[PDB]
Amino acid sequence: EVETFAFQAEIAQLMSLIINTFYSNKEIFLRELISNSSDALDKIRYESLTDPSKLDSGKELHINLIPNKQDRTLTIVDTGIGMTKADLINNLGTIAKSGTKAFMEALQAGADISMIGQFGVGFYSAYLVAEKVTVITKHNDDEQYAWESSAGGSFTVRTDTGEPMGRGTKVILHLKEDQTEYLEERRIKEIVKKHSQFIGYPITLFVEK
């Protein structure tokens, strides 16, 4: 069972701008996704201070970066609080509607795309380097779901039957044909050291065959 939804008009415009605008500093996508992972790990850590049972779905708080050259996918896995079904379809889109507006007015006043995180819509920067994004997430209060969108104004949501996660968010970036540089170890190491050197969580960079 696959449910197809439509992006809000303002979010579809933001994805079209990210995809069509000429902007060479594409590497900032990883800092936005890592900062997203660090935020979700902060939420579940704070919530577990008044409820240790929230860590029953996994005590470890870390971030993993998994490149795969055969699938041409870059995966950012974190053991954060996760996202519910209400989050994927309505809550994030409601919040992103005002952050997208403020992000567009700033772009017309001199700002550039790299400052997208200051408006709380940095997740969509994944479409700088990805033709399709698949997000596997699991919250303590909801089932495991699979979010997918190749832009174009629509996205899908379904109950994930794959490998269980326990708790966290898994962002799979199906990279564009000319963006395979973000699968090489030295390139990912260079980006992490330059943009995410002080993340208060262990970041493990997986290696390939």
Ligand SMILES: Cc1nc2cccnc2nc1C
């Ligand atoms: C799938 C999704 N994951 C997000 C993670 C952080 C912030 N916003 C997000 N928005 C969406 C639609």
